[PDB]
Design a protein around this ligand. Structure first.
Ligand SMILES: CC(C)(COP(=O)(O)OP(=O)(O)OC[C@H]1O[C@@H](n2cnc3c(N)ncnc32)[C@H](O)[C@@H]1OP(=O)(O)O)[C@@H](O)C(=O)NCCC(=O)NCCSO
Ligand SMILES: CC(C)(COP(=O)(O)OP(=O)(O)OC[C@H]1O[C@@H](n2cnc3c(N)ncnc32)[C@H](O)[C@@H]1OP(=O)(O)O)[C@@H](O)C(=O)NCCC(=O)NCCSO
Lengths: 427, 427
């Protein structure tokens, strides 16, 4: 049935990276118990609420398929409870600041004593052993540390952050790989391991293609697929020409192709008024004759100035600019359909509004309406992996401390000691 | 002990998404057999080579810890060899175009019959059942379909692709979660499943915070942390005020915080001559007093127009301009060390040049020098998950069909039959 049926997750996480991981584990069937601060809970509860007093969509979209217990881990009775919970857990996940869990008395060595089967899984900004090992980091700092910011945006503008959570959710998904790898180890050794993912490293893994470019640049002095390789195309903000004669670190290439075949972001009808009225259009090496037919340039088919990648290096941006011309009177969906007739990789810039109400994504279970009778229903992203013999069942995020008493009862505490913990402000 | 030791991977993949997944499985100890086209192999081999007739860095950086067999699969004898490899495989991974593997006769339904234990893992551009199910997709096309492009960049510029491989490597890592989940299913059921990750969906999962924003926007008409909600800060192409009055889909917010706490991209010393001389600086609500001490402005501690998130929105960018003037004569790293004193999430935009040769990343095994005695050494990104009881051993990428005869001998075929397959042009 579900991949992680019977896996108990002691979930210390807050914000995005850690909760994304444990939420997805929960979607795949894990029993996730989320430990939260007494009173305020996970910071995302009160972060950019759409309705006052109601848990924000930040919290609900990252904390479905979880139960919530409030715990003051600074008290000694809270530490005792944690020890009992660790003994029943298959994996513990934390994304507190560097050394925080250690300071509570729960180092890797002490956790192994408590449960030689448990997997400790951790997200940090930087890897253990790194000069910046002790720094706290959020999303965009990690994007900067891992190379994405330096290689995203335009040559005449600043390092640019991605809207996608390259630092946070991406780190959580990488940690999920780590946890699952560690569970596979455990089938063989009967033992738990520590796994850790640094945000910088999760970003750098996605920026692998730019480390390719850096070496190419060091070795050859040019990146022929970049706009800057076209003579007199690219200029900095003072109007100085940009060529690879003077570039020693991988530059921003605007909307160039990356690890795909060469492409660009082309305007469609209504771009002046509609921010998302664009398509991405690829000029792949095997598709020149098809492109020539589409744009009625038969004379370009057999001209060596146009029909190889190498011949196009000096003029690719002019070609894109001319192709764009054919899209002036067509919206992004019409251009997408037109390009599809030729087999040309090409698709629209989908707006978040379009994505939220797209029938396909709802049909395939990627955009999902969560039933929440307390807060009102909301949309979330479901499982991005589709399985032949299993469907996720997404349930609403917990209220703060909703399952405190439920969870304490499962640990074997009697009614009297639960009352006692409420009074002592442990729970 | 390696997590995926003894796991046999039949690897049809090419380009980036699929090969990233199987390379990373190989780093964790999997036995990866890469099937490739005769003569040219994986299209990355000849893609932007840095030396003629030598496998490109695109190829080597995505195909370490793999062996290579050439195989003409559109031949009767090639199909027979595949059947035999499938019987010995734990997982098959492919990222050909829609229906390609199906058309070779290897539908999921037939694969199950051949080996009821094997997992079929597949990356596609769009999910099965989607209206665009049948389209071919590279990297940035998926960035556009999944909402990242629409929400990346600036309000007065185009949709912008991330330099990070949101579409390709990101899908590969998601597929890896899917495969490891399926291996966990199999311990229970004794049976394999099909797992698929659509590139659109892997992008959307990282763009979850922007679907949060889309709903906040639908419910309230405003996103208070976005630049457009500061009066008379943002302007359209036509010098004219921007506000949320007429914004119905999540806009581009330049270098705003996203899913981290509010921040911006701030110039440091050398920014006109050095494209990456910047830090990202986070104003976390948590740490407003710690910030006022470093700014040399303690007047803002008590001012309620300066000391809440709600008080700060009408001039967030004025504060960032002020914090920026304090960095005007300190480089990236000086500013980062300064900020570390107060525990403020603040870090440098790391250039690819700095990352490629950073001592810390090499020490922690995140950037790795591969000993390649055929081609000369190169760098690569290692495993971004660090484990207490296991170290990856990265070995060089295979030459085309280097392991053909070796792989064919492991299948129990005699030396004369191997010569026949060579002569029949199937291998
Ligand atoms: C996200 C963040 C920057 C937030 O930092 P922060 O606002 O300063 O919180 P923090 O440093 O994690 O926690 C502060 C302390 O409260 C404690 N704490 C957390 N939950 C607690 C509870 N229920 N009871 C008692 N204490 C608790 C911690 O032990 C920590 O202890 P110290 O005072 O000894 O350092 C930081 O947690 C971090 O670097 N996380 C690791 C990487 C990560 O995942 N970051 C981002 C996730 S999403 O972008
Ligand atoms: C990446 C790409 C767009 C490339 O497209 P392409 O260059 O036209 O190749 P393709 O469509 O995968 O394969 C073409 C054909 O050759 C075949 N082929 C591949 N290897 C073969 C072999 N060794 N022997 C015989 N045939 C082979 C396929 O079966 C396919 O057959 P059809 O004619 O029946 O479609 C496409 O494979 C794709 O959409 N993949 C899925 C999404 C993905 O992973 N994208 C890229 C990731 S990185 O950016």
């Amino acid at each position: 049935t579900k991949p992680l049926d019977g896996i108990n997750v002691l979930d210390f996480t807050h914000v995005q990276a850690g909760p994304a991981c444990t939420q997805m584990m929960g979607f795949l069937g894990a029993n996730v118990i989320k430990i939260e601060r007494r009173g305020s809970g996970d910071m995302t509860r009160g972060w950019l609420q759409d309705k006052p007093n109601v848990d924000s969509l930040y919290f609900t979209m990252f904390n479905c398929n979880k139960r919530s217990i409030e715990l003051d881990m600074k008290t000694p009775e809270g530490k005792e409870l944690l020890e009992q919970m660790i003994k029943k857990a298959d994996v513990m996940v934390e994304n507190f600041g560097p050394g925080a869990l250690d300071r509570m008395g729960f180092t890797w060595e002490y956790i192994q004593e408590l449960n030689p089967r448990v997997i400790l899984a951790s997200v940090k900004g930087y890897a253990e052993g790194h000069a910046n090992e002790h720094l706290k980091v959020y999303e965009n700092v990690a994007q900067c540390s891992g190379g994405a910011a330096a290689t995203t945006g335009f040559w005449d503008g600043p390092p640019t952050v991605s809207g996608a959570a390259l630092g946070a959710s991406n780190s959580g998904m990488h940690l999920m790989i780590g946890i699952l790898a560690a569970l596979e180890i455990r089938h063989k050794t009967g033992r738990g391991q520590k796994v850790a993912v640094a945000m910088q490293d999760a970003v750098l893994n996605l920026v692998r293609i730019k480390l390719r470019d850096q070496q190419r640049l060091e070795r050859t002095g040019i990146l022929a697929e970049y706009p800057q390789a076209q003579p007199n195309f690219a200029f900095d903000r003072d109007g100085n020409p940009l060529s690879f004669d003077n570039i020693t670190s991988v530059p921003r290439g605007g909307n160039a192709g990356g690890g795909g075949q060469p492409g660009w972001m082309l305007k469609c009808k209504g771009w002046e008024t509609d921010a998302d009225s664009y398509v991405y259009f690829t000029i792949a090496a095997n598709m020149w004759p098809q492109i020539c037919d589409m744009i009625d340039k038969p004379e370009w088919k057999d001209d060596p100035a146009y029909n190889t990648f190498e011949g196009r290096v000096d003029k690719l941006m002019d070609i894109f600019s001319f192709i764009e011309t054919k899209f002036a009177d067509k919206d992004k969906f019409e251009v997408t359909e037109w390009a599809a007739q030729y087999g040309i990789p090409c698709g629209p810039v989908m707006s978040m509004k379009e994505l939220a109400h797209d029938p396909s994504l709802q049909k395939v279970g990627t955009v999902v309406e969560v039933v929440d009778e307390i807060r009102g229903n909301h949309l979330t992203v479901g499982a991005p992996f589709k399985f032949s013999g299993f469907q996720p069942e997404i349930t609403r995020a917990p209220l703060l401390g909703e399952h405190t008493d439920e969870v304490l009862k499962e640990l074997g505490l009697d009614d009297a000691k639960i009352k006692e913990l409420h009074a002592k402000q442990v729970v």
